[PDB]
Design an enzyme around this catalytic site. Structure first.
Site, PDB file in Angstrom:
ATOM      1  N   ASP A 133    -155.944  -6.136  29.950  1.00  0.00           N
ATOM      2  CA  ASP A 133    -157.279  -5.856  29.711  1.00  0.00           C
ATOM      3  C   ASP A 133    -157.463  -4.283  29.804  1.00  0.00           C
ATOM      4  OD1 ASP A 133    -159.974  -6.854  29.361  1.00  0.00           O
ATOM      5  OD2 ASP A 133    -160.245  -7.130  31.271  1.00  0.00           O
ATOM      6  N   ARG A 137    -163.886   0.185  29.174  1.00  0.00           N
ATOM      7  CA  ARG A 137    -164.721  -0.060  30.159  1.00  0.00           C
ATOM      8  C   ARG A 137    -163.821  -0.425  31.555  1.00  0.00           C
ATOM      9  NH1 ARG A 137    -162.975  -5.636  30.020  1.00  0.00           N
ATOM     10  NH2 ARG A 137    -162.438  -5.747  27.869  1.00  0.00           N
ATOM     11  N   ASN A 138    -162.451  -0.580  31.495  1.00  0.00           N
ATOM     12  CA  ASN A 138    -161.635  -0.467  32.606  1.00  0.00           C
ATOM     13  C   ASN A 138    -161.046   0.871  33.082  1.00  0.00           C
ATOM     14  OD1 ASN A 138    -162.178  -2.872  33.566  1.00  0.00           O
ATOM     15  ND2 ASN A 138    -160.604  -3.694  31.983  1.00  0.00           N
ATOM     16  N   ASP A 151    -158.891  -2.472  37.290  1.00  0.00           N
ATOM     17  CA  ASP A 151    -159.097  -3.706  36.959  1.00  0.00           C
ATOM     18  C   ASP A 151    -157.467  -4.363  37.136  1.00  0.00           C
ATOM     19  OD1 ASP A 151    -160.151  -5.923  34.348  1.00  0.00           O
ATOM     20  OD2 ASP A 151    -160.157  -6.046  36.538  1.00  0.00           O
TER      21      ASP A 151
HETATM   22 MG   LIG Z   1    -157.307  -7.729  34.086  1.00  0.00          MG
HETATM   23 MG   LIG Z   2    -160.656  -7.573  33.525  1.00  0.00          MG
END
Ligand SMILES: [Mg+2]
Ligand SMILES: [Mg+2]
Ligand SMILES: CS(=O)(=O)Nc1cccc(Nc2nccc(Nc3c(Cl)ccc4c3OCO4)n2)c1
Ligand SMILES: [Mg+2]
Length: 274
Positions: A133, A137-138, A151
């Site tokens: 992911d 945003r992470n 994350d």
């Molecule tokens: Mg993740």
């Molecule tokens: Mg995530």
């Protein structure tokens, strides 16, 4: 590491996560100076499975130590609410931070940010950890603009499990990972190309208003995101490299860091824009 709750002071709520609040606070333990921390809380109402999922993020973070990976300070589990404490990243999520600061950081600064992310990813891939992911945003940003990967979780996406970790983040995900669920460091490299585009666009949404299915079809039909406004052609080319359909042709993260390091040492090269 279990942290005595008397060592923690919660100062302000600064965000919301999947399972509760994100707070800024202070951690002071015997023999150590006080430090600023971020604090995720899990209050009443949760199932034990949800508690385990919550705390899995701490177990995974705890396995890592790197300046571009969010550092775990500890957990509070023998009391309510359950808490995960990490270093504090003053500037929050990179996509929103860049949108706030649209056009206000130089190309060299943006390349620096990208280099920090790529070093975090180099480390994860060396540790055989696949992020799955990777998105702006992470990425969290400190007061010195140092970017760090966040994350962490090992739950399958909803498409992997029973017929009847959330949904696959289509716009960040490599086409073979969408199609087959094969997530690898090479599919992370694809995602990293998307992060590049997010950064150089000061937080625009990848693929604008295209639907998830439109994105999937477009990529299969050879479409790739165009260089953002004012983007050095060399960065856009690195994005294209990350977005090769053949996962084996994409650069691995050591090579990505090397490419970015060369750019920083040779900033004249970044003057060429479309
Ligand atoms: Mg993740
Ligand atoms: Mg995530
Ligand atoms: C982006 S936000 O969290 O919605 N809001 C936010 C705003 C300003 C600064 C920080 N700052 C910030 N700094 C460090 C971590 C986090 N969030 C976070 C993550 Cl991502 C993962 C695990 C844990 C935490 O906190 C503790 O455990 N935040 C977060
Ligand atoms: Mg713009």
């Amino acid at each position: 590491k279990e942290i005595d709750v008397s060592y923690v002071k919660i100062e302000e709520v600064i965000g919301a996560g999947e399972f509760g609040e994100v707070c800024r606070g202070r951690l002071k333990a015997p023999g150590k100076k006080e430090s600023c921390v971020a604090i995720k809380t899990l209050k009443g109402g949760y199932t034990e499975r949800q508690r385990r999922e919550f705390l899995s993020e701490a177990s995974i973070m705890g396995q890592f130590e790197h300046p571009n990976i969010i550092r775990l300070e500890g957990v509070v589990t023998n009391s309510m609410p359950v808490m995960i404490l990490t270093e504090f990243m003053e500037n929050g999520a990179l996509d929103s931070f860049l949108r706030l600061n649209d056009g206000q950081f130089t190309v060299i600064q943006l390349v620096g940010m990208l280099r920090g992310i790529a070093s975090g990813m180099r480390y994860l891939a060396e540790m055989s950890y696949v992020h799955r992911d990777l998105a702006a945003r992470n990425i969290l940003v400190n007061s010195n603009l140092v970017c760090k990967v966040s994350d962490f979780g090992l739950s399958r996406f909803l498409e992997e499990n029973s017929s009847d970790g959330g949904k696959i983040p289509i716009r960040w995900t490599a086409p073979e990972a969408i199609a087959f669920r094969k997530f690898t460091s090479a599919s992370d490299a694809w995602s990293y190309g998307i992060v590049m585009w997010e950064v150089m666009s000061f937080g625009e949404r990848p693929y604008w208003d295209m639907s998830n299915q439109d994105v999937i079809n477009a990529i299969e039909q050879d479409y790739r995101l165009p260089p953002p406004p004012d983007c050095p052609t060399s960065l856009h080319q690195l994005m294209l490299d990350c977005w090769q359909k053949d996962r084996n042709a994409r650069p691995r993260f050591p090579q990505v860091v090397s490419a970015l390091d060369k750019m920083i040492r040779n900033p004249a090269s970044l003057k060429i824009v479309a």
